[PDB]
């Protein structure tokens with residue numbers, strides 16, 4: 001709010017953002033993928049896995065004959081993610097570059113306000129006092145084009161950058177419709193391997 | 196009637212559903228068309244997406260046209276009037292102000308058009324993908340052709356745009372049951388070939404996975420692997436053999 | 445700005461502080477060694493929350509990013525500075541009332557607040573309800589198979605192309621002026637480049653309507669025997685009443701676009 | 703303030719461009735997350751096999 005750089009708040013608060021992610025995660029367990037299409041129908045989770053080995057050319061007898069090894073292998077897999085996220089901070093590379101690129105846009109824009117842009121000064125009040133208003137309009141005209149062109153540059157950079165996010169928001173919406181609400185047969189879509 | 200039968204066979208539903216209920220589906224589809232008939236005719240808010248293309252394009256031109264009556268730092272906004280009033284040795288300075296003020300108003304409009312035209316190609320390629328998959332075949336991508344299991348779609352034209360008519364399949368009424376993931380008859384698991392094992396309380400049944408149709412468990416219904424201790428959730432049953440009464444007579 | 449007392453400690457030769465973005469905030473008083481801060485005065489955007497003018501005639505303003513004490517200053521109407529002012533997380537709301545209920549979203553405001561027009565009747569500002577909750581009876585021995593089905597028809601609408609438009613940079617900048625025509629040319633190749641950029645858009649629009657529609661090799665013919673096993677396809681097929689081959693549902697689609 | 707206004711509709715156009723982005727950001731977080739009809743409840747019996 002220092003020089004007109006207002007920031008609007010998001011409509012969806014972060015408390016209830018986790019409410020959706022506690023609902024998509026709570027229908028994947030019990031109902032399976034049925035709640036994506038019609039109405040949620042409860043399935044035992046040992047049988048819900050059995051629907052998913054049956055999509056990679058693997059017969060049903062693999063799971064229930066080895067139900068204890070897979071359960072411990074999955075539980076240990078979560079623990080590996082637990083240590084990998086907690087130890088290093090370089091895993092979140094993609095989300096960090098969004099904020100930093102946006103932060104360099106504002107700091108470039110703010111620091112442009114202390115440039116003369118062809119005039120003799122860079123203060124709106126000082127040029128009016130020192131020079132006569134019959135000829136101060138020529139000097140203050142230099143602090144129009146020098147500042148108007150610095151705004152249209154930032155807006156054009158924002159419109160191009162905002163097209164990247166929609167291209168990544170539509171890709172994330174595709175994954176939440178296929179990789180979560182069902183099983184995908186696209187090779188190397190949901191991680192390297194059979195999904 | 197057989198082209199419909201080729202499409203129920205892609206959602207895990209056996210062929211016997213269609214021809215045993217050919218009259219209910221025909222009236223349900225015919226009534227479905229009539230619902231689109233009234234919904235399109237009554238309200239005009241359904242065509243939101245195609246309307247915003249024209250209005251955004253028409254707002255660009257009216258902004259561009261109204262920029263022609265601005266001084267842009269000069270003393271006037273008429274090309275003919277500035278030449279008559281002021282001497283051409285110094286009218287070139289004033290008419291220079293009606294160069295940069297009008298050239299920058301054109302490159303702004305062109306840059307806005309190049310960004311906006313990239314949106315349409317991203318939507319034209321998505322429409323070309325749907326016409327290649329959702330019309331010329333059947334799609335198994337979940338929530339691609341409407342919310343639900345997909346059957347087919349039909350294309351319709353529109354002024355600067357296309358309109359689809361998806362036909363999906365949605366289950367209606369569910370029932371509680373009791374299940375067990377395996378069956379033991381002779382000290383051995385009896386994994387079913389296609390379906391799960393259900394029971395209403397007295398007799399166990401095997402049925403398909405999206406529509407209730409139970410059958411008596413036979414040897415053809417299942418394949419056998421392993422003994423009767425590794426699996427968890429095992430429930431005993433008797434699996435009838437069709438050969439022994441057939442070989443009896 | 446707004447001067448106030450500060451807890452910051454300067455250095456005994458130091459005059460006035462600054463910030464990260466080179467902005468002045470801390471100014472030492474010249475005579476007294478007390479330390480003063482600078483806070484910019486309150487400002488924000490003014491928004492109007494209204495229902496449909498066909499329905500009602502009552503509005504409620506929303507002063508954004510402001511504490512609810514600095515209102516009634518403004519500088520519209522005088523009456524819009526009272527009547528149970530309700531503080532939100534996104535700004536100061538005047539003309540509405542707080543409700544402890546929860547309803548679906550009608551008008552977005554910010555930070556999970558929705559305004560509507562409910563019954564006698566006034567404008568309320570509740571907190572949105574994220575749909576009706578549900579709970580499934582999960583157990584290790586339970587299964588649910590549906591016993592009856594439905595067939596439905598949704599509608600998906602996409603745009604394919606925009607209107608082709610060419611603008612002559614010679615006529616637009618200097619329209620029939622000998623002095624302006626020569627002075628425009630010495631600027632260089634700005635005019636030539638723009639007419640080549642707008643041609644790339646106009647060529648691309650023809651390519652867009654070619655890929656979506658022209659994917660069939662041969663035009664097929666509708667058979668005259670319409671016995672389709674019970675299905676009625678006459679609403680979507682072409683009707684020979686019109687001179688064109690336009691169908692019935694297409695006819696409504698063209699009239700709804702102005 | 704008076705000399706800026708005679709330039710025309712540059713100020714009006716930019717404030718209409720930036721609201722197009724701000725509306726679009728809310729639409730992005732709506733499509734990715736809000737795809738579930740009813741909020742479900744985690745069962746208390748956590749015996750997941």
Ligand SMILES: *[C@@H]1O[C@H](CO)[C@@H](O[C@@H]2O[C@H](CO)[C@@H](O)[C@H](O)[C@H]2NC(C)=O)[C@H](O)[C@H]1NC(C)=O
Pocket residue numbers: 395396397398
């Ligand atoms: C579970 O379903 C089976 C299959 O229909 C039922 O068995 C038949 O139920 C009818 C109901 O009137 C009886 O007339 C038949 O005699 C039953 N068949 C046999 C071979 O006895 C069974 O009763 C159902 N059980 C429950 C608890 O609903």
Ligand SMILES: *[C@@H]1O[C@H](CO)[C@@H](O[C@@H]2O[C@H](CO)[C@@H](O)[C@H](O)[C@H]2NC(C)=O)[C@H](O)[C@H]1NC(C)=O
Pocket residue numbers: 379429430431
């Ligand atoms: C399924 O049937 C087997 C075969 O009868 C049962 O195993 C018997 O269990 C009883 C006591 O539970 C023992 O006294 C017998 O010696 C067992 N016989 C064999 C061959 O193992 C088994 O208990 C049954 N399971 C269920 C759940 O009914």
Ligand SMILES: *[C@@H]1O[C@H](CO)[C@@H](O[C@@H]2O[C@H](CO)[C@@H](O)[C@H](O)[C@H]2NC(C)=O)[C@H](O)[C@H]1NC(C)=O
Pocket residue numbers: 219222223367592593594
């Ligand atoms: C499955 O649902 C359909 C409708 O969703 C049922 O069809 C209706 O049945 C009732 C009672 O028989 C009739 O009064 C209606 O006219 C039917 N509707 C239509 C559009 O024909 C159908 O009966 C249900 N299936 C079963 C086995 O009950």
Ligand SMILES: *[C@@H]1O[C@H](CO)[C@@H](O[C@@H]2O[C@H](CO)[C@@H](O)[C@H](O)[C@H]2NC(C)=O)[C@H](O)[C@H]1NC(C)=O
Pocket residue numbers: 676677678679
């Ligand atoms: C397919 O649906 C259309 C639309 O209702 C039917 O056309 C109407 O049919 C009724 C009687 O069935 C007539 O009274 C109307 O005059 C028809 N409309 C028009 C514009 O002529 C059509 O008959 C249906 N197809 C079949 C084979 O019955």
Ligand SMILES: *[C@@H]1O[C@H](CO)[C@@H](O)[C@H](O)[C@H]1NC(C)=O
Pocket residue numbers: 369370371581
């Ligand atoms: C029957 O199913 C409903 C939901 O479909 C569930 O709420 C109810 O608890 C079930 N009852 C039994 C006895 O399983």
Ligand SMILES: *[C@@H]1O[C@H](CO)[C@@H](O)[C@H](O)[C@H]1NC(C)=O
Pocket residue numbers: 427428429584585749
């Ligand atoms: C199913 O869960 C109940 C809950 O206590 C438990 O008593 C029972 O042993 C379980 N059965 C199987 C086969 O896991």
Ligand SMILES: *[C@@H]1O[C@H](CO)[C@@H](O)[C@H](O)[C@H]1NC(C)=O
Pocket residue numbers: 498499
């Ligand atoms: C306008 O209001 C009248 C009276 O309530 C109603 O009959 C009419 O349908 C409304 N028009 C629209 C477009 O909502």
Ligand SMILES: *[C@@H]1O[C@H](CO)[C@@H](O)[C@H](O)[C@H]1NC(C)=O
Pocket residue numbers: 511512513
């Ligand atoms: C608004 O101003 C009053 C008085 O200045 C103050 O007590 C109150 O805390 C302020 N509101 C907020 C949210 O800070």
Ligand SMILES: *[C@@H]1O[C@H](CO)[C@@H](O)[C@H](O)[C@H]1NC(C)=O
Pocket residue numbers: 543544
């Ligand atoms: C609404 O909540 C407030 C604060 O908890 C309380 O004072 C008021 O009585 C409540 N009103 C109703 C109708 O529950």
